[PDB]
Amino acid sequence: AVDSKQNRTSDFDANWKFMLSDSVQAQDPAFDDSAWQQVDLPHDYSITQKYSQSNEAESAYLPGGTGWYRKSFTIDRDLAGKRIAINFDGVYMNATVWFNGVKLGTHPYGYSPFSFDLTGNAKFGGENTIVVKVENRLPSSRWYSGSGIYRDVTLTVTDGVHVGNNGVAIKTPSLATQNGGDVTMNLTTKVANDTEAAANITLKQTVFPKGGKTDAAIGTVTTASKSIAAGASADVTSTITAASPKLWSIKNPNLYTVRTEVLNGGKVLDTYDTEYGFRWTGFDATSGFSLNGEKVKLKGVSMHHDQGSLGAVANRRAIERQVEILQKMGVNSIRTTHNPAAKALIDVCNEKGVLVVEEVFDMWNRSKNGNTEDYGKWFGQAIAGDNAVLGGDKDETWAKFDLTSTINRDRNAPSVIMWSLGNEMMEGISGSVSGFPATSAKLVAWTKAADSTRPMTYGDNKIKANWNESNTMGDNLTANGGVVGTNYSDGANYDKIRTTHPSWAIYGSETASAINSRGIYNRTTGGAQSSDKQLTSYDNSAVGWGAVASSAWYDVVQRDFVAGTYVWTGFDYLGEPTPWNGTGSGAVGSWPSPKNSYFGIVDTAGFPKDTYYFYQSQWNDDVHTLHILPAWNENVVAKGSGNNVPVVVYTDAAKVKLYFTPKGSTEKRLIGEKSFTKKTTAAGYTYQVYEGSDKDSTAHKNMYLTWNVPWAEGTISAEAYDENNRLIPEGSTEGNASVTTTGKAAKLKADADRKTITADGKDLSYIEVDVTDANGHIVPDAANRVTFDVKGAGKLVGVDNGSSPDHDSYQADNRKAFSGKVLAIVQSTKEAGEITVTAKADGLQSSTVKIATTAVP
Ligand SMILES: OC[C@H]1O[C@@H](O)[C@H](O)[C@@H](O)[C@H]1O
Ligand SMILES: [Ca+2]
Ligand SMILES: [Ca+2]
| CB contact at 8 A, 149 and 43 | yes
Ligand 1 atom at shortest distance from the alpha carbon of 576: 12
Q: How far apart are CA 812 and CA 817, in angstroms?
A: 14
CA of 146 to the centre of ligand 2 (A): 15
Centre of ligand 2 from the C-alpha of residue 139, in Å: 5
Q: Using N-to-C axis directions, what is the helix angle for 436-450 and 468-479, rounded to 10°?
A: 20
Instruction: Look at strands 847-854 and 833-840 and give their pairing.
Output: antiparallel
Distance between CA atoms of residues 455 and 44, nearest Å? 33
Q: Is 460 in the pocket of ligand 1 (CB under 6 A)?
A: no
Q: Which helix (H) or strand (E) holds 616?
A: helix 611-619
- Is 510 in the active site? yes
Burial 509-546 (b: 16+ CB within 10 A, else e): bbbbbbbbbbbbbebbebbeebeebbbbbbbbbbbeeb
Per the CB < 8 A criterion, the answer to whether 9 and 154 are in contact is yes
Give dist(CA 406, CA 419) in Å, integer.
Answer: 10
Residue 825 β-bridge partners: 766, 798
Tell me if 447 is assigned to a ligand binding site. no
> Of the bound ligands, which one is closest to the alpha carbon of residue 621?
3
d(CA 676, CA 723): 9
337 Cα nearest atom in ligand 1: 10
Answer whether 543 contacts ligand 1 (Cβ < 6 A): yes
- Tell me: is residue 141 an annotated ligand-binding position: no
Helix (H) / strand (E) element for 625: namely none
Question: Which strands, in side-by-side order, build the sheet including 95-99?
Answer: 37-39, 16-20, 65-75, 126-136, 95-99, 102-107
Q: 427-433 long-range CB contacts below 8 Å, 24 or more apart?
A: 427/368, 427/461, 427/462, 428/142, 428/368, 428/369, 429/363, 429/366, 429/367, 429/368, 429/376, 430/366, 431/366, 433/467, 433/469
- Of 787, 774, 711, the closest CA to residue 745 belongs to 774
Q: Is the CB of 513 under 6 A from ligand 1?
A: yes
Q: Domains (ranges, CATH) in the chain? A: 1-159 (2.60.120.260), 160-280 (2.60.40.10), 281-625 (3.20.20.80), 626-745 (no CATH), 746-857 (2.60.40.10)
Sort residue 698 into left (φ over 0), alpha (ψ -120 to 50) or beta.
beta
Ligand nearest to the CA of 624: 3
CA distances for 460 relative to 127, 378, 385, 452, 483, angstroms: 51, 21, 35, 22, 11
Local structure of 249: helix, strand or coil: coil
Binding residue per annotation — 576? Answer: yes
Contact 423 CB / ligand 1 (< 6 Å): yes
DSSP 441: H
Element (H, E) at 448: helix 436-450
Which one from 135, 261, 359, 424 is the annotated catalytic residue?
424
Cβ pair 810, 311 in contact under 8 A? yes
Residue 381 CA to ligand 1 center (angstroms) comes to 26
| Cβ of 461 below 6 Å from ligand 1 | yes
56 is in an annotated binding site: yes
Residue 342's nearest CA partner among 378, 389, 303 is: 303
Q: What's the 154 CA to ligand 2 centre distance in angstroms? A: 33
Calpha distance 659→668 (Å, rounded): 6
Beta pairing partners, 228: 199
Q: Give the separation between CA 69 and CA 19, rounded to whole angstroms.
A: 7
Up-side HSE of residue 492: CA atoms within 13 Å toward CB? Answer: 2
Q: How far apart are CA 45 and CA 135, in angstroms?
A: 11
Phi, psi (5° rounding) for residue 415? -65, -30
Strand arrangement, sheet containing 794-800? 747-752, 764-772, 821-828, 794-800
End-to-end, the C-alpha distance of the chain in Å comes to: 19
The helix or strand, by DSSP H or E, that contains position 37, with its residue range, turns out to be strand 37-39
Neighbours of 670 (CB within 10 A): 10
The DSSP bridge pattern shows strands 484-487 and 506-512 to be: parallel
Residues with CB under 5 A from ligand 2 (ion): 139, 369-371, 583
Residue 552 to residues 290, 466, 510, 705, 840: CA-CA distances in angstroms?
21, 20, 10, 17, 42
Separation in Å, CA 794 to CA 13, 319, 762, 768: 18, 20, 10, 17
Q: Which helix (H) or strand (E) holds 578?
A: none
Cα Rg of the chain (Å, integer): 28
Is the distance from the beta carbon of residue 510 to the nearest atom of ligand 1 less than 6 Å? yes
C-alpha 174 chain-centroid distance: 31
Cβ pair 149, 69 in contact under 8 A = yes
Question: What separation in angstroms does the CA of 98 have from each of 29, 68, 249?
Answer: 10, 11, 43
8 Å CB contact between 209 and 217: no
Q: Is 72 in contact with 129 (CB distance < 8 Å)?
A: yes
Q: Which of these, 508, 539, 540, 535, lies nearest to 522 by C-alpha position? A: 535
Q: Is 723 part of the annotated catalytic residue set?
A: no
DSSP code, position 546: S
Helix orientation angle between 316-328 and 343-352, rounded to the nearest 10 degrees = 40
The identity of residue 211, as a single letter, is G
Measure 585 CA to ligand 2 centroid, in angstroms. Answer: 8
CA separation for the pair 798, 574 (Å, rounded): 14
User: Resolution (in Å) of the shown entry?
Assistant: 2.0
Question: Where are any strands of DSSP class E within 89-160?
Answer: 95-99, 102-107, 114-117, 126-136, 153-158
**Residue 152 labelled as part of a binding site:** no
CA distance 615 to 664: 34
Residue burial 555-576, b: 16+ Cβ < 10 Å; e: rest: bbbbbbbbbbbbbbbbbbbbbb
For residue 546, give the ligand 1 atom closest to its CA: 1
522 labeled binding residue: no
Instruction: Output the residue whose Cα is nearest ligand 1's atom 2.
Output: 513
Smallest CA separation from ligand 1 atom 11, residue: 568
413, containing H or E segment:
none
What 3-state DSSP class applies to 399? helix
Q: Check pocket membership of 424 for ligand 1, CB cut-off 6 A.
A: yes
Q: Which atom of ligand 1 is nearest to the CA of 423?
A: 8
**Cα–Cα dist 165/207, whole Å:** 19
Q: Mention every residue, 6+ apart, whose C-beta is less than 8 A from residue 136.
A: 46, 64, 65, 66, 67, 92, 93, 94, 110, 145, 147, 148
Query: 58 in ligand 1 pocket by Cβ < 6 Å?
Result: no
Identify which of 513, 511, 622 has the alpha carbon closest to the alpha carbon of residue 562.
511
Beta-ladder partners of 243: 182
Residue 59 CB neighbours (<10 A) = 27
d(CA 610, CA 535): 12
Q: Which of 303, 513, 545 to mutate to test the pocket of ligand 1 (most atoms within 8 A of CB)?
A: 513
CB 816 within 8 A of CB 808: yes
Strand order in the sheet with 114-117: 9-11, 153-158, 83-88, 114-117
State the amino acid at position 66 in one-letter form.
T
Tell me the pairing of strands 847-854 and 756-758: parallel
Q: Which helix (H) or strand (E) holds 118?
A: none
Ligand 3: distance of its center to the CA of 222 in Å? Answer: 49
Identify the residue whose C-alpha is closest to ligand 1 atom 4: 513
Task: Catalytic residue, from 135, 358, 469, 510: name it.
Answer: 510
